[PDB]
Scaffold this active site. Structure first.
Site, mmCIF file in Angstrom:
data_model
loop_
_atom_site.group_PDB
_atom_site.id
_atom_site.type_symbol
_atom_site.label_atom_id
_atom_site.label_comp_id
_atom_site.label_asym_id
_atom_site.label_seq_id
_atom_site.Cartn_x
_atom_site.Cartn_y
_atom_site.Cartn_z
ATOM 1 N N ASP A 187 9.224 2.955 1.396
ATOM 2 C CA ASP A 187 8.014 3.594 1.903
ATOM 3 C C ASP A 187 7.928 3.391 3.417
ATOM 4 O OD1 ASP A 187 5.473 4.413 2.684
ATOM 5 O OD2 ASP A 187 4.455 3.588 0.937
ATOM 6 N N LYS B 28 2.408 10.343 8.311
ATOM 7 C CA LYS B 28 1.666 9.854 9.486
ATOM 8 C C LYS B 28 2.236 10.355 10.820
ATOM 9 C CE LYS B 28 -0.798 6.078 7.287
ATOM 10 N NZ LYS B 28 -0.510 4.937 6.376
ATOM 11 N N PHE C 293 0.840 -1.188 0.000
ATOM 12 C CA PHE C 293 0.000 0.000 0.000
ATOM 13 C C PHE C 293 0.880 1.244 0.000
ATOM 14 C CE2 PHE C 293 -2.385 3.405 2.162
ATOM 15 C CZ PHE C 293 -3.468 3.514 1.299
HETATM 16 C C1 PLP Z 1 -0.933 5.201 5.134
HETATM 17 C C2 PLP Z 1 0.126 4.872 4.111
HETATM 18 C C3 PLP Z 1 0.211 5.604 2.922
HETATM 19 C C4 PLP Z 1 -0.748 6.717 2.625
HETATM 20 O O1 PLP Z 1 -0.515 8.057 3.119
HETATM 21 P P1 PLP Z 1 -1.697 9.151 3.089
HETATM 22 O O2 PLP Z 1 -1.298 10.096 4.155
HETATM 23 O O3 PLP Z 1 -2.924 8.373 3.369
HETATM 24 O O4 PLP Z 1 -1.670 9.739 1.737
HETATM 25 C C5 PLP Z 1 1.189 5.297 1.979
HETATM 26 N N1 PLP Z 1 2.083 4.269 2.213
HETATM 27 C C6 PLP Z 1 2.012 3.538 3.384
HETATM 28 C C7 PLP Z 1 2.993 2.427 3.620
HETATM 29 C C8 PLP Z 1 1.033 3.834 4.336
HETATM 30 O O5 PLP Z 1 0.973 3.181 5.380
#
Ligand code: PLP
Ligand code: PLP
Lengths: 389, 387
Positions: free
Chosen positions: A215, A244, A130
């Site tokens: 990521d 986050k 994701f």
């Molecule tokens: C939550 C998340 C995202 C998304 O970030 P947003 O602030 O929702 O745009 C992207 N990559 C990972 C691994 C995530 O956990």
């Protein structure tokens, strides 16, 4: 009211949180909840942390916004802090994890285009990944159900299984620009990369002159008990994304890289003054020996509770993750029923998460008080008990 | 090419329509961080909303709703064509949501082959791969690998070109009622109404990108209200949060229902703190008195720009709507917009460009008359230095 106002994209809880302090939250009826979810690993210092409130108020009465034409003092200070603490030499600030990932993927693509070949376009990513919900990021994401149905997707993305080093070696060539990976796939059932897999990714990127993109939107900013997960592994990426936990609740994100890579596009670009002030105060707290040590102490406190719950109710086949990203996989008897325990959890006054239909996920404040861990886990044990009975 | 500030121009404090840098130099702000700070810097109402909500609750995830989001959603629904709202963080994200929605609606309602998006030359929709490909500047979309396909660009204000490229395989027409970045060009009544009629004919969704021209900028709450042309989807940001990162995507229930649980979209989006600030901003902007004032203030700016042209002979056209002002430079000063901007900064006034030939002004919607006069006197000085 929800069904009358906002698009049918979410299925929220029956209750509406109105106030939060630390790892406790209250709804409209005054019912008190323990927070083990943290808005999906966002509120890493809990709700309305006095230092973060202080930063928000002080910058909020000074200056909120500059365009990307200007720099600003909070952005420069936060940039410096991230540069000093990591592999990064340059930082690019945005608002969300999706935007940070957009920036990282575009940069990896553009770096390959100008430094090697316009045909060096292949992005290798992983099943269950994701990376956000923009067309590009969701296409790099490894969940077809999320990327289907929006017209022609950005091409040259290849998906292989997470932790499958041979698959990566098989698909990589001189036409590959990047490998994009979550050091721990949070949404994908809280699966951590193996040392050999992550190290192998670095070697393959080196071999094919591709950029390794980490990521760390979920697993970064202290989540694992190190400032970033890559530090635990000892594998340095070319580009890293963070969000986050970065702003502890304030919409902010960062893309970290080297000067050599950044030059394909000052040590810092962009960054909302208000956002970066809050992220600065958040960084100052998280990046201390004692907070990072406590994350590991707190994890074992959580894990011991989950072990006791399993001993009592025969419910978990596996407890995994790193630091205060905790995954509890359900046994075959309770397969597909993660949502049931989440709902019962909320009924018992504890906020938890899922990571797919087979996994319970916990992502509490990194400074969650021991008393809140014990109370919240007692509530969750009662919730499990109600489901079992 | 791109406009960047030097090491000696770092803004540290803002108060109303005035900004101070590190060396304490004062500037009059006619730029608004590119039409973002529509109520100026540190507006007491917005500061109060930020501080009060900041003591209460900042963030829950989208598996929860919150009171500030509900309040803001209701206010947008009551005041516009919208029946459903989706909150995000940036205009780019709002546009991503809009474009994905138009695509998915066509997919499920009509055909998976109904994918064509019609967009316009010089359009700006953001800098994500998808939004920049819908954008009409090839220089900004080149060099990032395979672009998402089925996007067709035609000239802005060219109705015949749109008619020519549209068919039953078209899902959307995406347009800024006023192209802000693209030389501050307003759609003609015929063109915009024509887009509505063509979308009706082809069962395509009309998407208005009002990220720049929305939230009071034109003297109406949204530019579509001036035209009397109702879109299927509208996007809003910038002015929405008056400096706080927030955005919104507005549509009808029928269109919104095309999305199901998991189709979109955000972690931060729908943010309690963001929505409280945007609520406070909405409450001020959406009043007859502020919206009237925007037209009064526009003419105060325009009269100054006319006087500058009378003395210096530098403008061929003055255009835009409300407090989105474009002033196109005469042929003898083509490509000099950046130079007038920097000279402005030297003289203690912050202005914008809209391409290399156009000066842009996007001040606070409540910029004081005294700031207008002082700032334009500073700009007239800057012009004199250049010519
Ligand atoms: C939550 C998340 C995202 C998304 O970030 P947003 O602030 O929702 O745009 C992207 N990559 C990972 C691994 C995530 O956990
Ligand atoms: C500024 C702008 C955008 C971009 O919004 P961000 O908040 O920068 O993502 C998109 N479309 C238009 C018309 C704009 O003016």
């Amino acid at each position: 009211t929800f069904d009358e106002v906002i698009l049918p994209v979410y299925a929220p809880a029956d209750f509406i949180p109105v106030k939060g302090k630390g790892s406790r939250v209250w709804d409209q009826q005054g019912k008190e909840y323990i927070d083990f979810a943290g808005g999906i690993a966002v509120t890493a210092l809990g709700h309305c942390h006095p230092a973060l409130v202080e930063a928000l108020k002080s910058q909020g009465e000074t200056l909120w916004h500059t365009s990307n034409v200007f720099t600003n003092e909070p952005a420069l200070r936060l940039g410096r802090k991230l540069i000093d603490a990591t592999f990064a030499e340059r930082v690019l600030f945005m608002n969300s994890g999706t935007e940070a990932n957009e920036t990282a993927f575009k940069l990896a693509r553009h770096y390959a285009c100008v430094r090697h070949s316009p045909f060096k376009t292949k992005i290798i990513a992983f099943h269950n990944a994701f990376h956000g919900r923009s067309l590009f990021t969701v296409s790099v994401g490894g969940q077809p159900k999320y990327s289907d149905g929006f017209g022609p997707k950005p091409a040259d993305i290849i998906h292989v299984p997470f932790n499958d080093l041979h698959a990566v070696k098989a698909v990589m060539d001189d036409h590959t620009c990047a490998v994009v990976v979550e050091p721990i796939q949070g949404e994908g059932g809280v699966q951590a990369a193996t040392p050999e897999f992550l190290k192998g990714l670095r070697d393959l990127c080196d071999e094919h002159q591709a950029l390794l993109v980490f990521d760390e939107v979920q697993c970064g900013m202290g989540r694992t008990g190190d400032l970033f997960a890559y530090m635990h592994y000892g594998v340095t990426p070319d580009i890293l994304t963070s969000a986050k936990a970065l702003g502890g609740g304030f919409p902010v994100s960062a893309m970290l890289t080297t000067q050599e890579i950044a030059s394909a596009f000052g040590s810092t670009y962009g960054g909302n003054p208000l956002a970066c002030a809050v992220a600065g105060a958040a960084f100052d707290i998280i990046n201390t020996p004692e907070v990072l040590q406590g994350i590991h102490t707190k994890r074992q406190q959580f894990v011991q509770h989950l072990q006791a719950i399993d001993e009592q109710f025969d419910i978990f086949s596996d407890i995994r993750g790193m630091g205060l990203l905790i995954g509890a996989e359900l046994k075959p008897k309770y397969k597909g029923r993660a949502r049931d325990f989440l709902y019962a959890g909320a009924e018992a006054g504890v906020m938890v998460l899922n990571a797919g239909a087979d996994v319970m996920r916990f992502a509490p404040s990194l400074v969650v008080e021991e008393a809140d861990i014990h109370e919240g886990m007692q509530r969750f044990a009662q919730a499990v008990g109600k489901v079992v009975a």
